[PDB]
RNA sequence: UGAGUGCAGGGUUCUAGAUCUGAUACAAGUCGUAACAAGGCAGCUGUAGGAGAACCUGUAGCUGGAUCA
RNA sequence: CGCUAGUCAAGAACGAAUCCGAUGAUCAAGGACGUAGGCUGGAGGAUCGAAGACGAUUAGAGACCGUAGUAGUUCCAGCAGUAAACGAUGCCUACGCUGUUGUGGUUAUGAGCACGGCAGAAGAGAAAUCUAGUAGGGCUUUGGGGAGAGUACGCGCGCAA
RNA sequence: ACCAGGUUGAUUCUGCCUGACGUGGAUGCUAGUCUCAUAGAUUUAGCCAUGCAUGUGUAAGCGAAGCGAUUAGUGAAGCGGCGGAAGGCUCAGUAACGGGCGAGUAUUUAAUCUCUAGAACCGGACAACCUCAGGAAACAGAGGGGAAAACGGAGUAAGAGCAUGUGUUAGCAUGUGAUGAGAACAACAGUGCAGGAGAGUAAGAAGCCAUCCCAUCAGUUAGUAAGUAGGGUAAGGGCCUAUUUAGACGUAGACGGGUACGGGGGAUUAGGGUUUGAUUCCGGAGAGGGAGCCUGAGAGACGGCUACCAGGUCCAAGGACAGCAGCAGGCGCGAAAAUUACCGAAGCCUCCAAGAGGGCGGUAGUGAAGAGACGUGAAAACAAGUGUGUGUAAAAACCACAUGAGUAACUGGAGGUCAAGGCUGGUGCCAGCAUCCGCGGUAAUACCAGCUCCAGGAGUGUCUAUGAUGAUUGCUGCGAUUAAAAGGUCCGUAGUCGAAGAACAGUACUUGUUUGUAAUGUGGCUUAUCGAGAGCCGAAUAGAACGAGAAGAGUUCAGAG
């Protein structure tokens, strides 16, 4: 190819957009921007079905060109804007805050929260560095970059942003007895809490999980956000609390157990 | 050319057998049937659950044997196909009453096809007028015409099937 | 034109292989730049993403540092001595990195001059500097960098590259 | 045409003989056989003829059609 | 120097094994010069490419085994 | 960096050719009758001569022989 | 491979409280032997006898039969590489019923070990018959309806055939 | 998870031919209604008349002529900005960075995000405008004004590389320095543009593993294999060059030749298999054949430029133009494939935009390639028509109600395999039929016809490839005394295969956890009258990361032989 793609087949997009095989064969290219494309939705897919709001590209446009949305306390005028997981969402006339969250199943999903809630994030802090005229930073998994820090925060934490301020609230670390939410694998969506920890060398480290309803689970720390200062969430979670059910268990729960 | 939409028959292998000509002419002549199509039809329809409750029976697992009998004992109840005392959670009711499909007829089905229940329900004085009512949209469910011979009647829908006069 | 493919080179086994595409331009090369000495000459060539890369095509002076006093002094060059890869460059004067060049001594002269241990440390350098001898090596890559830069040679070094001259 | 051989080939239906004129147009088919091999009893002819002058063999003995003309 | 790697390769249909090799040219750095020779197993890192065919470099060897140059008793006993 | 084009060669695939020589099918033509019965000299395998043609003759072998003696 | 003596190397089997310790099975490529007839050079030449020549027999015999006759048939030094070179049954290694008869050693004289022949049985097989019973033991050669064809072109060996 | 007919006067075997059944193309005859898919791939990557497929402007870069004005305004020729490197078409070339799985560097990246973040003066032209005015056309001249956020210079911040300290390694210190800039505007209340550091997207180069046929192709290679040093590139590297070392690859098939877009997948199938993949998704290559190139963040671009070779077009003869493996369409070639149609609507992409553009895409028309559901009467009482409404971008079809009525089957067969007539008339080894076996010489259930039956049925016959039949390719699973088939005998390398006893180790081996699959397929549920269809759910192959078990395999030992 001679240069840059611009267009995306509606058979390639991301499984967790959801969207449905047979009306047309293209699909919206999200901007450069935060998150990756993988882990990332653009913001007229959210208007049209995750929230219905808009029904044709006319209304889509009208929109934002009259200046309503606002996303991480930012007003914003690009169509394909990409929003990821932690990612408080807004309209500031009827006063409606909403945060993006996976169902169970791993598809995207809005959660409509107060306004309390609305003020901050959380993050994970992937570098530190030394600039320029001795100043030191850390960065973090969405693009964000903070100076002047506390020195202490470390690779691989977690931190809560304030979003008026922009600056870093609060710092939790990859500990035994911590609450975790799950970003990618097989256990999308699931919450839990951390049992133990398997360090490795050169390659990923390894977590053990009990969930709330009694089962366990393990995956790579690459996984896994760490969502609570010790005993209990930070940020509140869906109408069902991230508890998965096999097929099977869906049956004994609706028929009555196998009777000797 | 490959294309979308499944084949629903398969034809025999041997062309002029006189055992099978005799015996599919005389379930045609019964039953009031278009052609032979309309019943290679139901049959593979019916060797179907046959292997279904063939492959149950000799899995090793029990997950699998748990969740998937449930399934297939209560669909063919609804249809009015399977009638019996199935038990649930109980492992030798479940695998008694799969043995029990294992010996299940075509002549099952066709007993569920609309032109045969408007005849046996006493609405019509044969199999062949029957047809001719579904025809002509004489006959009605749940206040709504039914244009198609071959609806297949679940259990209970009995009470709602009702004829009307001609146009005329 | 010239190209750094292996479009036409053979496997490792022997063989040939065939040819499966025409040339592409992120696969290009250019014509050797031949920096000789003489008064200043420098082109800039416009390169991928739009960046600027400083060609030298005569130049007349160099930085030169010496490395135990910790200064630097800017001096005229002379001629080639030595040079490793290929005894024509030397006989043509063409400047490259590791060529072994000739300079004007008298700015390090009046420098080292001032260290009153100078003379036992380094007799062969003093030796050098009162005959009218200077000499220096190259460490820059005049035609990426459009400049020359080096080190005078002391202890050792001088001991080494001595012997490579001399007939 | 397409080879530039010149080849035998059967005329099948009772009076067929009569329907074809010389330098007529032919289209030519196969015998059935796994390779090109003679079937019955005529001896070393490998294919016959289908349709003259754009038009159905059988339709043209059995006249229910006529030559283009 | 050339370093020979072997393993068995699975054939569906007769449900059976081959025997395979292939062969990979290392840099040798002269600290090993006269500790490696042949038939020695080698332990090798990966790196860019040093030239058109190498690419990885000994980082160090286990030394083909002797168990013991067997006890020879004294005469006297 | 090189398109095109001179002049010699090769490598492939097809095709022409006076004349010679195989094979196959020849309803039944001409000359004999070599094999199948001890087929009228028991047959056959190797090798070497000879001959209108099947074949005949020397030498060593075999029974699938007309002899389990 | 068949007369008698003398001489020179190596092998098989048997008896037994000898020594070493995995040195082994089968085999593309490569190498050595191979009746007879044939070929290159020397020695020799009794008997027999391709080719060639006659006498008979026959329609005709060029053949069969008889007379005669050459190359060959013998030896030394080599080339060649085929046979119904067949028990038409690959080589190691197993598990397997009885009676009888041989050959060579050894013996508690009761028998064994190696190499054979014969006659039944049981299984097997399309039968005839059985080197063919039982069997996912290992390794090599090899066939896939008749013909054309073990023929054409190319290649390797050979003095030629 | 299946058989049948055919060597003989009969029999039992070996063995092959033929029938019976899926699927991809071609074709004969016949054809009522509605719904879902798909169409010049096979032969010529052959040749092309015509029309269309790429352009974009605000309150907010510069604004000429014209119109008009108490020294206002207007409305815009050009310039600048951003795109034209995506999407669409095809499979020629390539046995290979062409393909699958991991990893993130030795690299460059306009837009976009977060943090941060800007005191600058001067000068000409180019295009349009104005006056002449050339050329058959295509296309151009003189002369004179005049702008920019366009362009070139000045100062000035900044600043590559080199050297030494200190912190791998940013950073900081010191010495030395080539180079060397910069956008604001509007208020409907905003939109831009300079520098850094990190992200995000896209390439370039790399690691491992898998890949077709011929031995009547056995030796191949000399930038070839390596080293030291330098040039070159965005960057590692024989990528290229100088002097030294002789390497590298092969019977476990090198080298040569023939052939091929590769996967996700498709067809058949009890199991083990055998065949195919131009063709909705991903990646690669091309634009008549070869080769060079400017501009740009990005092309070795062809709806950009330049030259040759093969072909064309217009001319006033001097010159000019052009490339349908985009969408319709034409000619050829063949046994082989649709309309020079509508589109401010759906899905997306492009711009300076409360708007403009798109043959990309959607909508219908055409055709028995494929796949659903139903008509052709009932015993009292039956499609297809028509009119309104709906439906859509506008439509047609579909559906609702209301009117008329009484229309609607063919293809192959009837001696055996193989379902169904020794019926009647012609013909006499003729004419014909017959996959195979076989019929006909005047008493033909087999030809040519009439009449009755059979089979499938809006469908049925034929030809051609392939899978099955087939244990006639044999891993599972065939044969070699006489049917086809054990080398004349030894030695022997590569190759394949190899005691008992006591111990040992974990790379194969098996298994856990975690990754690895959009569509298709598999197990399900829910809504279109029903059924294909549509929508949502769950699990999954090969391949890779980290642990575990030690029977078999492997390695060692000798108070074992
Ligand atoms: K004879
Ligand atoms: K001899
Ligand atoms: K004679
Ligand atoms: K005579
Ligand atoms: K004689
Ligand atoms: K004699
Ligand atoms: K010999
Ligand atoms: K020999
Ligand atoms: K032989
Ligand atoms: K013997
Ligand atoms: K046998
Ligand atoms: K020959
Ligand atoms: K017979
Ligand atoms: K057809
Ligand atoms: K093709
Ligand atoms: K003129
Ligand atoms: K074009
Ligand atoms: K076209
Ligand atoms: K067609
Ligand atoms: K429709
Ligand atoms: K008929
Ligand atoms: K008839
Ligand atoms: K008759
Ligand atoms: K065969
Ligand atoms: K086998
Ligand atoms: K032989
Ligand atoms: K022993
Ligand atoms: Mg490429
Ligand atoms: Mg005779
Ligand atoms: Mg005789
Ligand atoms: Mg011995
Ligand atoms: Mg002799
Ligand atoms: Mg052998
Ligand atoms: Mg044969
Ligand atoms: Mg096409
Ligand atoms: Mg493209
Ligand atoms: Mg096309
Ligand atoms: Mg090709
Ligand atoms: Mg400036
Ligand atoms: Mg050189
Ligand atoms: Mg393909
Ligand atoms: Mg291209
Ligand atoms: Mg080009
Ligand atoms: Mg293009
Ligand atoms: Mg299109
Ligand atoms: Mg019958
Ligand atoms: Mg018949
Ligand atoms: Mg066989
Ligand atoms: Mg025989
Ligand atoms: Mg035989
Ligand atoms: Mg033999
Ligand atoms: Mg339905
Ligand atoms: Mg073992």
Redesign the pocket.
Known sequence: ????????????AP?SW????????????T????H???ESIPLCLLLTRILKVAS???EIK?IM??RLITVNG?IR??S?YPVGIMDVLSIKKTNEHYRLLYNI?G?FVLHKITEEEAQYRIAKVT?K??????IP?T?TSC???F?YADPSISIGDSVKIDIKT?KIVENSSLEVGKVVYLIK???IGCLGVITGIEK?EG?HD?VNIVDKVGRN????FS?ILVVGADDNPWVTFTKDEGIKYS?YEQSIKEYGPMNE | ?????????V?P????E?ER?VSE?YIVGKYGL????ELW?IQKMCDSFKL?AKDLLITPDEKEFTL?SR??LK?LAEWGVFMEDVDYNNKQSLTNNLEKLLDLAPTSFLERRLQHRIFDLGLA??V??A???I??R?VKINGS????????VKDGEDGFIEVVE??? | ??????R???????????????????????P??NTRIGERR?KQ???????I???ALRLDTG?I?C?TH???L?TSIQNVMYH????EFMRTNIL???AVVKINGQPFKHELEKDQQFESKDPVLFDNLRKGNCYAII?????????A???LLQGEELKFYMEKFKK | ??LNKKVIAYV??????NQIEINDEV?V??????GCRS?????GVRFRV??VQK??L??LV?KK?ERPA | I?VV?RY???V????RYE???????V?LSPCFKGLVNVGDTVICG?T????????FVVVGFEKKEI?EK?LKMLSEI
Do not use: W
Request: hydrophobic share 20%; glycine share 10%; aromatic share 4%.
């Open positions: 190819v001679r240069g840059p793609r611009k267009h995306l087949k509606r058979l390639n499984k959801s969207l449905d095989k047979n009306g047309g064969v293209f699909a919206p290219r901007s450069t921007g935060p990756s494309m993988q044709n590209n006319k009208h060109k009259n930012n005028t690009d394909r199943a598809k570098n560095k030394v600039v320029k005229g001795n930073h960065y693009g964000g970059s100076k922009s694998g097989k256990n490795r390659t390894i689970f393990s995956t790579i996984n097929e | 050319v490959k294309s979308k939409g499944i084949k629903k028959i034809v292998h041997r062309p002029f006189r000509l002419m278009r052609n032979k199509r039809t279904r998937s399934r297939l669909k004085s044969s062949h007028q047809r001719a009512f025809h002509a004489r015409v039914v244009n198609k011979p071959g609806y297949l001609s146009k005329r | 034109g010239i190209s750094r493919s292996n036409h080179k053979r496997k490792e086994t022997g063989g040939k292989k065939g040819l499966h595409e025409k040339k592409r331009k992120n696969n290009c090369g250019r050797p730049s420098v060539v416009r390169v991928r993403g739009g960046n890369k400083h060609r930085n540092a490395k910790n200064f630097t800017n490793p890869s290929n005894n490259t990195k590791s460490t820059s890559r005049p035609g990426q960098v459009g400049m830069d080096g080190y | 045409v397409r099948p239906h009772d009076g067929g003989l289209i088919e196969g015998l059935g056989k796994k079937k019955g009893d005529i001896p289908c349709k038009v159905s059988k339709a059995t059609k | 050339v790697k068995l390769h699975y569906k249909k007769y449900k025997r395979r090799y292939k062969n990979v040219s840099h990966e860019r490419p040093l030239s058109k065919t190498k690419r168990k067997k």
